[PDB]
């Protein structure tokens, strides 16, 4: 199956309609309209580079999240009111916001996008 490194590029990478495309295109209304979600409008590179940068407390308690020290374009898609599955309807969102995920592996590489502070 997909790595987790690999679902974290789906998911989260990506170099009020904009979300509506890449939600479907992602797979991420597939069996569930998914909530929330944030994309993160920046290199590969820059976000894998992440990973050596300012080491922070995840939200799950573990202690392997680090934080951007460069403001970093995302999008957040949040889901209306009137969107149900299979027509997942979302508010496309924008910010320049630092970003923090979770890394692991060797080599060492975002599997999980924890927050935007």
């Not at 309807?89 to 999980?112: L, S």
Request: charged share 20%.
């Amino acid at each position: 199956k997909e790595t987790a490194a690999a679902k974290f590029e789906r998911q989260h990478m990506d170099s009020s309609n904009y979300c509506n495309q890449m939600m479907k295109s992602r797979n991420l209304t597939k069996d569930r309209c998914k909530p929330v979600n944030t994309f993160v409008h920046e290199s590969l590179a820059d976000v894998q580079a992440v990973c050596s940068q300012k080491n922070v407390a995840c939200k799950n308690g573990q202690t392997n999240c680090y934080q951007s020290y460069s403001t970093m374009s995302i999008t957040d898609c949040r889901e209306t009111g009137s969107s149900k599955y299979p027509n997942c309807a979302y508010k496309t969102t924008q910010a320049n916001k630092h970003i923090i995920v979770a890394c692991e592996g060797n080599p060492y590489v975002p599997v999980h996008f924890d927050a935007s502070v």
